Design an enzyme around this catalytic site. Structure first.
Site, mmCIF file in Angstrom:
data_model
loop_
_atom_site.group_PDB
_atom_site.id
_atom_site.type_symbol
_atom_site.label_atom_id
_atom_site.label_comp_id
_atom_site.label_asym_id
_atom_site.label_seq_id
_atom_site.Cartn_x
_atom_site.Cartn_y
_atom_site.Cartn_z
ATOM 1 N N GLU A 33 -1.267 1.834 8.541
ATOM 2 C CA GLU A 33 -2.336 2.786 8.256
ATOM 3 C C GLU A 33 -2.003 4.164 8.810
ATOM 4 O O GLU A 33 -2.406 5.194 8.240
ATOM 5 C CB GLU A 33 -3.652 2.274 8.824
ATOM 6 C CG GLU A 33 -4.163 1.002 8.163
ATOM 7 C CD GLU A 33 -4.594 1.218 6.727
ATOM 8 O OE1 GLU A 33 -5.740 1.657 6.513
ATOM 9 O OE2 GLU A 33 -3.792 0.946 5.811
ATOM 10 N N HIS B 14 -0.258 6.174 6.314
ATOM 11 C CA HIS B 14 -1.201 6.838 5.419
ATOM 12 C C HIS B 14 -1.729 8.116 6.048
ATOM 13 O O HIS B 14 -1.835 9.145 5.373
ATOM 14 C CB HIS B 14 -2.380 5.927 5.080
ATOM 15 C CG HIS B 14 -2.024 4.703 4.300
ATOM 16 N ND1 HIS B 14 -2.461 3.445 4.656
ATOM 17 C CD2 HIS B 14 -1.283 4.540 3.180
ATOM 18 C CE1 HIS B 14 -2.008 2.562 3.785
ATOM 19 N NE2 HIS B 14 -1.289 3.201 2.881
ATOM 20 N N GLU C 111 0.682 3.943 -0.744
ATOM 21 C CA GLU C 111 0.955 2.661 -0.113
ATOM 22 C C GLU C 111 2.455 2.428 0.077
ATOM 23 O O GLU C 111 2.868 1.739 1.020
ATOM 24 C CB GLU C 111 0.309 1.567 -0.957
ATOM 25 C CG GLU C 111 0.677 1.690 -2.427
ATOM 26 C CD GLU C 111 -0.101 0.759 -3.326
ATOM 27 O OE1 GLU C 111 -0.959 0.008 -2.822
ATOM 28 O OE2 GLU C 111 0.145 0.784 -4.549
ATOM 29 N N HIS D 80 -9.212 -7.537 -9.953
ATOM 30 C CA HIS D 80 -8.911 -6.213 -10.486
ATOM 31 C C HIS D 80 -9.141 -6.142 -11.985
ATOM 32 O O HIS D 80 -9.170 -5.042 -12.550
ATOM 33 C CB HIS D 80 -7.473 -5.822 -10.165
ATOM 34 C CG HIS D 80 -7.157 -5.851 -8.707
ATOM 35 N ND1 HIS D 80 -6.897 -7.021 -8.025
ATOM 36 C CD2 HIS D 80 -7.068 -4.856 -7.796
ATOM 37 C CE1 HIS D 80 -6.657 -6.744 -6.759
ATOM 38 N NE2 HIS D 80 -6.754 -5.437 -6.593
#
Ligand SMILES: *[C@@H]1O[C@H](CO)[C@@H](O[C@@H]2O[C@H](CO)[C@@H](O)[C@H](O)[C@H]2NC(C)=O)[C@H](O)[C@H]1NC(C)=O
Ligand SMILES: CC(=O)N[C@@H]1[C@@H](O)[C@H](O)[C@@H](CO)O[C@H]1O
Ligand SMILES: CC(=O)N[C@@H]1[C@@H](O)[C@H](O)[C@@H](CO)O[C@H]1O
Ligand SMILES: CC(=O)N[C@@H]1[C@@H](O)[C@H](O)[C@@H](CO)O[C@H]1O
Ligand SMILES: *[C@@H]1O[C@H](CO)[C@@H](O)[C@H](O)[C@H]1NC(C)=O
Ligand SMILES: *[C@@H]1O[C@H](CO)[C@@H](O)[C@H](O)[C@H]1NC(C)=O
Ligand SMILES: *[C@@H]1O[C@H](CO)[C@@H](O)[C@H](O)[C@H]1NC(C)=O
Lengths: 597, 147
Positions: free
Chosen positions: A357, A360, A384, A487
């Site tokens: 993270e 990111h 990502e 999804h």
């Protein structure tokens, strides 16, 4: 008198009025995510309605002059990302019908629940109800029971909603001049105008096939090793020339194969060593983990992290007075505010996702000099992809010795690396053919070369040949299976989780060879290495004001995806697996349904 | 002469006020010439000039026809004209408003916190100098040959 002048003034006011309203929405949603109150819910919804009505008003203002007279592409890219309208040019009945379809499809999937074989009292929802019996169990019968009980319930009822969904989405797509709504999904990869860097929406699809065609044999040299290792596992349900029954992969609808590892561990008393108890023993804390995570980015020579990030983030759960959402998320609030939301315990896995993270966060810090319309990744899959590689660097044993979390006398041999490569290859390899298959299916159904009477056939007509998987229980046109996946129903594109993988194995190829490493790519790391950080930060700082192919050439010097370093990352696995599969057959026969058994 | 000019800007814009710099502030708000006669002072003030509901007091001009002559105040906030057409007060499109506001909050990063800036522009005139420096000394002795 020109045209670019008024577009310049319009953008100069629009940025100033957009970053403020976006900060209002982002701070509202953050304050909800820390503390669950319905007051925060209604304030967050009012903020979202304000921010959406503003975008609606600026967009419907923007279409008074076309893009065609802008020769400073920084402005034309912004007005091209602005000027699409969508359902605003659509009529008043069809938009309400479409939103009703979307809400119903989401609520049947999300709040759905299937019952036992005669008990109302113990009924199983999806998460974490239905998932555990298919996650870690050994009875074939109840895995078949749950695998049928999910789809036979949910997909049949989602089927006519999906028909209405595709017939409205195709007319909406042709109302925005992308024939075949999949072409509208491919339009984010469209690059035009920059010569020597051009692209097309039709040029994409075969490239996916032309990147798949080298991944193939390694997968079968994986797959037979999987399949023969299910000989001693389920010792009746194995066709040594054949596909796989799709409720045995230790999980749900065939995406991640991690749970087979406890069965398919090669070496017994030579464990893949986790160092969580090492942090437990010599007095650690949750704060020291993120301090060392900052200490990693000092070691590459990047910008450090602001004091306003350490002031008001959340890196520890509040105990029990409040109820807090802990799904670990890197939150760029905008306007120089970055936070990290996590309910970190003392775990090596939280150390690894802390790096995942924080990558990111560094990526959000890098492009914060762009116009507000252009602050993202250069394509959808970069973010990502740059987030992943810090975990691959941080899992290295010598990196754990240099930080005192591994005693510097410890040796490493080949069976440890084979166990580690197998537990990595269950994550990385298995997602790719399934992701390609599902995206190919949805692309074809949106193309309309498959009418409504072949859908649940054609799915399995791909699922045997490309993935290597046979259904265990016969399906007819009552069903709809591609809709059993999260999804699919939530209208999310699925292509990116393919391309991500390819992108990451270019980056560790290009950065970590520049730090002058010896030996394989799987023992590589960027530590005490400044030119690697310079080569990276010359890409992260760009934004999306350039074509993504230029941002790829900035790192690797190519414009495409090459799975060949994915070959090089997985060498010792492959060259040992050949001597494994010397006593089997590779590939699969495709007849073998287990009701012609 | 002493001239103390004063304002409050964002953090990241504090380098736009010097001999030479151009951008938003120097062209449209506060022009300082490239050979000026003084010093520039600033210090960070986020703990004071912001509060948790924001603060929309400080404004700035974001639109003009041309640049500023150095040291020239302008306050006229009539509706800007961008396109080639009448405006007559009425607006909506190619008639925008030249004054924007600030939104300081005490959760921001350093690149947006409100910095306090004061400009000391000083020079001599042929009039007697109504502004000298410091003197200094030690003590006073007696009955000794001294300078
Ligand atoms: C969750 O946050 C809300 C608001 O941030 C808290 O609710 C009130 O907050 C105000 C501050 O503006 C306090 O003066 C009130 O005392 C708070 N209400 C109550 C009942 O204490 C709320 O307290 C937070 N949740 C928890 C569990 O503390
Ligand atoms: C993005 C796009 O194609 N713009 C359309 C425009 O062509 C059309 O005239 C208008 C009708 O309201 O809807 C919008
Ligand atoms: C910030 C950091 O980790 N620096 C390391 C240092 O600790 C280590 O002694 C040296 C040799 O491996 O490499 C570098
Ligand atoms: C080879 C080398 O210099 N290794 C150093 C070690 O001596 C030192 O204790 C540590 C922390 O400073 O960083 C590393
Ligand atoms: C237009 O392009 C030039 C260089 O090509 C650049 O200096 C300028 O910033 C661009 N315009 C905008 C609004 O960014
Ligand atoms: C960044 O922080 C680390 C401590 O985490 C420190 O050692 C290093 O000197 C700092 N570098 C800069 C540029 O602040
Ligand atoms: C592991 O390494 C040792 C040391 O060279 C070697 O003797 C042994 O054959 C290796 N085992 C495998 C399975 O590669």
């Amino acid at each position: 008198s020109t045209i670019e002048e008024q577009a310049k003034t319009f953008l100069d006011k629009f940025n100033h009025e957009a970053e403020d309203l976006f900060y209002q929405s982002s701070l509202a949603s953050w304050n909800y995510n820390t503390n669950i109150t319905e007051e925060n819910v209604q304030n967050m919804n009012n903020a979202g309605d304000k921010w959406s009505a503003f975008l609606k008003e600026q967009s419907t203002l923007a279409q008074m002059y076309p893009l065609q007279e802008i020769q400073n592409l920084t402005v034309k890219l912004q007005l091209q990302a602005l000027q699409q309208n969508g359902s605003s040019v659509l009529s008043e009945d069809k938009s309400k019908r479409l939103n009703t379809i979307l809400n119903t499809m989401s609520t049947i999937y999300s709040t759905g629940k299937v019952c036992n074989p005669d008990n109302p009292q113990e009924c199983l929802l999806l998460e974490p109800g239905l998932n555990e019996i298919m996650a870690n169990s050994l009875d074939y019968n109840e895995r078949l029971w749950a695998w049928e009980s999910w789809r036979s319930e949910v997909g049949k009822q989602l089927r006519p909603l999906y028909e209405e969904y595709v017939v409205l989405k195709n007319e909406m797509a042709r109302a925005n001049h992308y024939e075949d709504y999949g072409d509208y999904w491919r339009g984010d990869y469209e690059v035009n105008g920059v010569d020597g860097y051009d692209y097309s929406r039709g040029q994409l699809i075969e490239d996916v096939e032309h990147t798949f065609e080298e991944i193939k044999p390694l997968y079968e040299h994986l797959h037979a090793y999987v399949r023969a290792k299910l000989m001693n596992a389920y010792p009746s349900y194995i066709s040594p020339i054949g596909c796989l029954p799709a409720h045995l992969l230790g999980d749900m609808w065939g995406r991640f194969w991690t749970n087979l590892y406890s069965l398919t561990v090669p070496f017994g008393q030579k464990p893949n060593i986790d160092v969580t108890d090492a942090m437990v023993d010599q007095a650690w804390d949750a704060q020291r983990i993120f301090k060392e995570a900052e200490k990693f980015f000092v070691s590459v020579g990047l910008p450090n992290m602001t004091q306003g990030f350490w002031e008001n983030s959340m890196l520890t759960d509040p105990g029990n007075v409040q109820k807090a959402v802990c799904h670990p998320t890197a939150w760029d609030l905008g306007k120089g505010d970055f936070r990290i939301l996590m309910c970190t315990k003392v775990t090596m896995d939280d150390f690894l996702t802390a790096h995942h993270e924080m990558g990111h966060i560094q990526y959000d810090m890098a492009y914060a000099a762009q116009p507000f319309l252009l602050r993202n990744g250069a394509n959808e899959g970069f973010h990502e992809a740059v987030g992943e590689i810090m975990s691959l660097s941080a899992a290295t044993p010598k990196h754990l010795k240099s930080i005192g979390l591994l005693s510097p006398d410890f040796q490493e041999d080949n069976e440890t690396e084979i166990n580690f490569l197998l537990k990595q290859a269950l994550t990385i390899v298995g997602t790719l053919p399934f992701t390609y298959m599902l995206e190919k299916w949805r692309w074809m159904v949106f193309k309309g070369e498959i009418p409504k009477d072949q859908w649940m056939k054609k799915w399995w007509e791909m699922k045997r040949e490309i993935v290597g998987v046979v259904e265990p229980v016969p399906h007819d046109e009552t069903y709809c299976d591609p809709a059993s996946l999260f999804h699919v129903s939530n209208d999310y594109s699925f292509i990116r989780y393919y391309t991500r993988t390819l992108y990451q194995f270019q980056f560790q190829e290009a950065l970590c060879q520049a730090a002058k490493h010896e030996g394989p790519l799987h023992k590589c790391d960027i530590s005490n290495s400044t030119e690697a950080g310079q080569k990276l930060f010359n890409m992260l700082r760009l934004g999306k004001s350039e074509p993504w192919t230029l941002a790829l050439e900035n790192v690797v010097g190519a414009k495409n995806m090459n799975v060949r370093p994915l070959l090089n990352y997985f060498e010792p696995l492959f060259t040992w697996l050949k001597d494994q599969n010397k006593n089997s057959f590779v590939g699969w026969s495709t007849d073998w349904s287990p009701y012609a058994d | 002469n002493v001239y103390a000019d004063s304002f409050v800007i964002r953090g990241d814009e504090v380098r736009q006020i010097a001999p030479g710099q151009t951008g938003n502030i120097a062209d449209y708000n506060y022009k300082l010439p490239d050979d000026f006669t003084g010093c520039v002072i600033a210090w960070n003030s986020n703990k004071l000039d912001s509060k948790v509901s924001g603060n929309y007091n400080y404004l700035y001009r974001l639109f003009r026809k041309s640049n500023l002559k150095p040291f020239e105040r302008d306050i006229s906030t009539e509706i800007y004209q961008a396109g080639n057409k009448p405006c007559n007060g009425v607006a909506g499109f190619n008639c925008y408003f030249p004054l924007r506001s600030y939104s300081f909050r005490p959760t921001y990063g350093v690149g947006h916190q409100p910095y306090r800036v004061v400009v000391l522009s000083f020079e001599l005139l042929h009039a007697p100098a109504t502004v000298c420096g410091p003197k200094k000394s030690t003590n006073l002795v007696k009955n000794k040959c001294v300078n």
